Amino acid sequence: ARQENPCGPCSERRKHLFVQDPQTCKCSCKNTDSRCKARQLELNERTCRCDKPRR
């Protein structure tokens, strides 16, 4: 342990659907446009929830 400064979640906190890299703090969603498309939906990249297909 040295210079212990944990990363702060990108989209505030409430975006629990996002996961974050522990060292570089870069965030990616667990949910995807591929998942949503399989459900005949598309991803709302703000919340990373599946919404009506904007197509």
UniProtKB/Swiss-Prot annotation:
This protein's gene is called VEGFA
Please, which domain of life does this record's source organism belong to? Eukaryota
What's the family? Belongs to the PDGF/VEGF growth factor family.
Free-text tissue specificity from the UniProt record: Higher expression in pituitary tumors than the pituitary gland.
Briefly describe its induction: By hypoxia. Regulated by growth factors, cytokines, gonadotropins, nitric oxide, hypoglycemia and oncogenic mutations.
Residue span relative to the full protein: 347 to 395 of 395
What clinical condition is it connected to?
Answer: Microvascular complications of diabetes 1: Pathological conditions that develop in numerous tissues and organs as a consequence of diabetes mellitus. They include diabetic retinopathy, diabetic nephropathy leading to end-stage renal disease, and diabetic neuropathy. Diabetic retinopathy remains the major cause of new-onset blindness among diabetic adults. It is characterized by vascular permeability and increased tissue ischemia and angiogenesis.
What is this protein's name? Vascular endothelial growth factor A, long form
